[model samples]
Target: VRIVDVREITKPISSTKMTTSLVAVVTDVVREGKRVVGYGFNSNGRYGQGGLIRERFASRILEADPKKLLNEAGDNLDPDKVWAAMMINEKPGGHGERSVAVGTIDMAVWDAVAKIAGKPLFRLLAERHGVKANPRVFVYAAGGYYGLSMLRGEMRGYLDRGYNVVKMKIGGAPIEEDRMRIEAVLEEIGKDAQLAVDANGRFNLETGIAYAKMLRDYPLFWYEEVGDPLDYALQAALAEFYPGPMATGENLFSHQDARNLLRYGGMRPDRDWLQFDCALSYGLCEYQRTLEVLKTHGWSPSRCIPHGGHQMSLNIAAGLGLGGNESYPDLFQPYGGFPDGVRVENGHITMPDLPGIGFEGKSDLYKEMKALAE
Candidate 1:
């Protein structure tokens, strides 16, 4: 089969506080018609990559022969070849929006490849890489951006929904004030749930060390992205002050970037978590390379709990045996959850056996996906 058309649709997914872009890639292959059209979107907390998708990568994919994009086995589309085709003449190193652009199309390509094989993307991924697919994957509820009173309610709601680990935002307020917020949430949740804090890469070296000193007193699940993602020096210095599990790498876009983090970011293979979102990086094709980097450095795949709270990461977690995937239980709208009937129980989700990335199983999201073609 050959690719007949490549197109994209852009839409707004915003909350009262933030606005995010969602771009869907629709690739139509020969003889399959609309049913075989693949869908992919940008993850939340990032701007849409519509212009790059429309002007750059889409045409490269459309112009390439589908046969050439296939694997040596000819059973599925080769994501690495498709990625190279999209990035033919692109210069390396500044892996900013370009990674997102390529990753968006890469997601659709994998989805189409899996659908063509008539299996779920997770199953296809496992079978291709010779890994055991575990449908039951651990997940954590990630939202704690409220006041003391509201935070209590939010934590209660997540606990009611079977979530055991929760994440909250820090570094936006004063360190003392943030400490109070953390203490209050810890008190409210009270041994029933573990709390994780995210600075969103907002701190500097001194402030990260200071926060590390203060945060070491509390039993946080992890202190995440305390400083700039690229500041390996800051990360390494902070490790001297903080002896707990710390997580980063959401902002790293390529396998080389991930490798640098492993080499110099002072991340502990025994405890620290890696949150490389394939959607934000160069997609699963590159994610495989990142896993290889981790293996060479003695990091377990279980240490990788990718950053995106989407079904794509869910499929990867289940198929590849990552520790867990992040979940936005109360944020990011129709783009941040599982299929309609899938529910979290005890901080875990059971993957549905739906084909591809299982977007069609999500009614509201699938309605928007189908509208992209119409």
Candidate 2:
């Protein structure tokens, strides 16, 4: 099987929501005269990568014979080779948007590989790595972008849906005001659910510390991305004040970057969490290396709950034995969720045993994916 064509379709998720670019890597391999097409997309919070995908990674993939991009077993595509091909001539560091570009393509390649192997991506991943795939994965409802009244309602909504842990956004307001909001959420949930707050990398050292001081008092599930993601010193410094489980690394793109975080960023393996979204951080190929970095550093894979509330991360979490995956209960429509009919029960969702990423199990999402080649 060889790549016959590669294409993308960028769609506006909403007038107010971010746009997502869906990539289709079409292959010459025919199954009943229908070409095998692998699908992938950039997660929300980042924009579409059409220019980079078209001008760079897509061509490299199209130019290479699909057979040569396979593992030694020759049964599945090697994502590491595909990542290297996409990153030809790319310099080290500056992982900014390029990682997203390569990561988007990497996601499609894995999807295609698993589809060709006639198994779910999670099962394929487990088989390749000699691990057990746990279909049931823990997920937390992540969203708190509303006023006090509305926020209380949102928290209730998640709790009604069986979510035991919920996250909220902070740092957009004054520390005192954010404190009130956090308190309000705590009161609203009140032992029924735990809270996690995200700064979205919005604070500096001083402000991060101040927020940490306020947050240190609360019984939150975790405080996430207190400062700039790259500010290892800030993270290390914050650990001095905040003794609770802190989470970061969503913006750190490479395994090297993750290594640096482990080496310098004062993340406690016993309590803290890592949020490396493979779809945004050069894909699962690099995520595997990041896991290795964790193992070498005495960190358990259970400490990783990757960002991007998508099925791909869910698969990785279950297959690779990561702590868990995030979930957007009512955000990033058609992109940030599990397949339809898969409900969250007690803050966890069960993976469908469908081939590939299970995009076909989501009727609306599958409609959008099928439109690319139709």
Candidate 3:
């Protein structure tokens, strides 16, 4: 049997308006007269916000003790299963209904397992799976904070740092407004640079198709989430209508959703790209499982990049030889005279070899953020 403790830590940063919470779940087990502990933390950032669907699971964790959940279901509660269950029970949203707490719990467990092994999670997974060491993974800059000036500054900085790929958010303004901004960006970075846009599922089919057609001449990589991801039929139709590639899957929680994308041929296997974040959905196990499904469709992992699970997924992608990494611009904000783990150089991110995620919660900053659960 194991005893578990869960606590929430929030950090307030000057970069953004909302305080970020690190949901910590620690498990203590007695193995052969020694105490074995596993730790994970979920920092609710861009995709960490809970959607309405996950409120019930959040309530369960808040109302019930951590030890009860752990002790009653030791080795029985697959963090992945719990996460899927929560999603199955909720409404769909970008951040997901139970994404924050679920991610926190999963991360904490991985951390704890890594701590026990005295190895980085990546290294541990590699050794177990026989994946060799990879030098570095390529990274792309993701900025465009509502098309504000800050976004321009961030974009230029990343380009100056040698990044050739950049992504930005859209959907708050008119379609023509987004077109103008993208045109300006092309002018600045030139046509050779790879530009990707994600609308966070903001447009209907007609508007989305119109937008893609507008950027057809530019060297755009893909238009992500132009419409609801659940609208698999719509996404497929758009893929057929537009000349540009259609990419999505960040918000999908299950393999069933992924299979839907494949079955519908909504996403062209050879031409289009697929991306899903590990921490936000399922961790490595489910991630690998999803890859198997992708493989059957004649799609490769290189065409699919893991979204927010930067630390874990970068290595996995490299091990699997994926295309490039996605760097969240907002998360790199300076903390305690140190930058977050994001480093973009020449359109590539170097994977850190340091044990267990290479980055820990900035304790001083984490203490400033409050846990919304309980």
Candidate 4:
């Protein structure tokens, strides 16, 4: 299969506040007069990169010789090669939104490869890694904070849906109020469910330490992204105060950064989790490098639950034997969550058999994607 064209369709979407993102589509030449298209996006939260994708990355793919982008057997487009094509004139450091731009196209490239192989992405990934593909994957119910009542209600809803783990944003409210809110939500969720907290890099050293002192009292699933993402010293300092499993790495966009984090970030390999989001990072190609970095650092792949709840992460979690993938439950619309009829049971969702990244199985999402192609 050969890539005839690569394009980014700008989609304005929001989980809470509005942010525009792009859906990159890779259209292959006719397979008996039928086109096989693969779709990908930058996941949620990142703003749109239509300018970057259209003006730079997309053109590189088109300008490159199609054969150079193919696998060794020349049957499929190699994702790493496609990634290189998109990154033609790019510099090394300070990835910024450039990572998102290339990552979106990288996703489409892999999706096309899997479709060309007539296999689900998870299965293809597993075969590539020489591992058994497990269809069941763990997912946590993720929620953004509102008010106390709303938060409590949200936790109840997820628990009712068989998700035993739920996450909420912190650091917005007063420390005491956040504490009270956590307690209330905890009480509401009851004993069977666990809660995780994210500060979203809102706290500084003293404040992070203060929050750590208080948060250590609760039995949280994890205390996440507590300090500034790049502050390895702050993270290491936090480890002394918060002995509970802490998670971060969503903001780090490359394997070099992952290496820096492992080298200096003081992340605990046995306990804490790494959440390098593939869609937001440099896609799975870079994420694969991050995984190797994790292994080199003595971290387990099962400790990784990617930040994005998209199906791409779901496939990666199952294929690569990551501990779990995050789930948006009610957020990010048809773009995030399980396929039709796939439900969470005991904090896990069983993967359904669907080609590529399984976007075609999601009727609402696929319609928009197909419309983008037209």
Clashing pairs in 1: none
Residue-wise lDDT of candidate 4 within 1-374, one digit each (tens)? 56777666675574445455546455654443558887888777777677788888888888889888888888777889888878877877986798888788778888878888888999999999998899999999888565678878888999999999999999998899899989988999888799999999998999999999999999999999988889999998898899999999898889999899999988788889998889889899999999999889888999899988888999999999999988887777868777777899999999988989998888888887887773
In what order do the candidates fall by lDDT, top score first? 2, 4, 1, 3
| Pairs in steric clash, model 2 | none
lDDT of 1 by residue, 1-374 (tens): 55566667666674633333444444444324554777777777776687888788888877887789878887656778888888888887998888887777778878878887888999998998797699998999888874688877887889899899999999988999999999988998897889999999999998998899999999999999988899998998887899999999899999999999999987889999999989879788889999999999999999999998998899899888898999988667777899889998988999999988999899988887777763
The weakest ten consecutive residues by lDDT in model 4 span 24-33
If scored against the real structure, what TM-score would every candidate get?
0.95, 0.96, 0.74, 0.96
Question: What ordering of candidates by TM-score runs from best to worst?
Answer: 4, 2, 1, 3
User: Model 3, poorest ten-residue lDDT window?
Assistant: 365-374
> What lDDT does each candidate get?
0.84, 0.86, 0.59, 0.85
Q: Candidate 2, after superposition: displacement of residue 246 in Å?
A: 0.5
Report clashes for each candidate as comma-separated counts: 0, 0, 18, 2
Error of 4 at 226 (Å): 0.8
- Report lDDT (Cα) of residue 16, candidate 3: 51
Hey, what RMSD does candidate 3 come out at?
A: 5.7
Give the runs in model 3 whose Cα sits over 4 Å from its true position. Answer: 1-4, 10-19, 27-96, 133-135, 147-153, 309-316, 319-322, 330-342, 361-374
Query: Which residue pairs does candidate 4 place in steric collision?
Result: 20-48, 302-323
Task: Give the C-alpha miss distance for residue 115 in model 3, angstroms.
Answer: 2.7
Which predicted model would earn the best lDDT? Answer: 2
